[PDB]
Structure 1
Amino acid sequence: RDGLSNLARRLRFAMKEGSIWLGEQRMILLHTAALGALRKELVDTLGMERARGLFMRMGFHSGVRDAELAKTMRSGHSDFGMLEMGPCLHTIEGVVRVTPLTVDINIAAGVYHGEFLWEDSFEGDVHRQMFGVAQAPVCWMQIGYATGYTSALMGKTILYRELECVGCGHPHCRILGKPLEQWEDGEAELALYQPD
């Protein structure tokens, strides 16, 4: 659409340089099976908790870099048209089919309240094939990205949580995003986003 066809110009493949660039960031195409295998080794080795952390932060970094890109395409787009580049880029990257349910966003006022549908989550899919169906949501990297993108664009922390997840048997994933303090457990969600 207008959010994908436009962000498509920022993507160029250079088989002449063996490289891929999305905006100003170099990219690779990576086999989901390969990342699933890495997940199983990290989970089995560092535990499920330490592992989710590592994936959430990898997602965060990715979401931030795409927010930088989006911000160079500010133009005459609204806050919402700004926001929607995130879901757009997430789709182009082959991670999930993002479907915005309802978004309330003002950047200047520090107001954001967002809810999205996720169809065909790579991360849920991969997780059931490696661990089987899961107790709690598994799209760690995908959530980190949401968190990373939206914080960067708002210049303030916006944590997301998966409300429903394909990893837990549900038909899809579903997520809610809102400012850190608007979260009861928001202090400790933020803790997941720190290395040391």
Structure 2
Amino acid sequence: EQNKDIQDLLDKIVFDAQHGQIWFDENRMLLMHTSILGFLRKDLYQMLGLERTKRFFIRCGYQAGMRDAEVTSKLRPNLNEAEAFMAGPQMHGIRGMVQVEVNELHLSHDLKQFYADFNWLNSFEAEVHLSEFGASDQPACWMLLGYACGYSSFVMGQTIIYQETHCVAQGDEHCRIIGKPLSEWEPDAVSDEIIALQAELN
């Protein structure tokens, strides 16, 4: 009854337990344990840097986001920018990664203008990061955040960057992000700006 606006998305998800397949349109998926992600994160951190690990989860996310936007692209042409864009935040729910809640969204392809402010609720990433690390000193939601930047950047034809303003990892009640075109912040590893920003805004 109540995934009225999700439904068109669910309609592309095919479970096929009997053949070891799960599909979103043309692409496969895997139902994965979060605590297994928690291990992959700590093991990576142990092998590489905080920095190289960080960088991986973000680039990862950027990818997932771009692919979902490819997918959900030819999918709501009846609708407008805002309602189509939403597919993104909805997919993050669908994949059980995070609950997106919109404080503010203003966008327009042709104006090359974007500003998003959302609350992330129930982030897995923050939850797993606490087990393996405890109270962090920076935000933890790298993957979610890469995906955020990715999805968005696909949708507008320009690079959209997010800052995680508050994070459950850091003790904040919910997590929160803000997203604006790269330049409105005063070779496509956009991965490096994200880290440089959370740095050069102490």
Q: Structure 1-normalised TM-score?
A: 0.93
What are the Cα deviations for residues 51-105 of structure 1, in whole angstroms up to 9, with x where unaligned?
Answer: 1000001100000010011111032110001110000001000000111111001
Identity level (%): 40
Q: Which runs of 5+ in 1 are unaligned?
A: none
Q: Which residue pairs with 1:21 in the alignment?
A: 23
> 2:178 is aligned with what amino acid?
L
Q: Structure 2-normalised TM-score?
A: 0.90
Structure-to-structure mapping, 1:59-98, within 5 angstroms: 59-98=61-100
Question: What's the CA shift for 1:6?
Answer: 2.4
Partner secondary structure for residue 117 of structure 2: strand
Please tell me the root mean square deviation across aligned C-alpha atoms, in Å: 1.6
Q: Which residue pairs with 1:11 in the alignment?
A: 13
Question: What's the CA shift for 1:8?
Answer: 1.1
Partner secondary structure for residue 7 of structure 1: helix
Q: Which runs of 5+ in 2 are unaligned?
A: 197-202
Q: Does 1:161 align with 2:158?
A: no
Question: What's the CA shift for 1:191?
Answer: 7.2
Q: Which residue pairs with 1:31 in the alignment?
A: 33
Q: Which residue pairs with 2:193 in the alignment?
A: 189
- 2 CA distance for matches of 1:170 and 1:190? 20
Contact 2:92 2:98 in 1 (8 A): yes
Structure-to-structure mapping, 1:60-139, within 5 angstroms: 60-139=62-141
- 1 CA distance for matches of 2:76 and 2:195? 31
Question: What's the CA shift for 1:158?
Answer: 0.1
Q: How many residues align?
A: 191
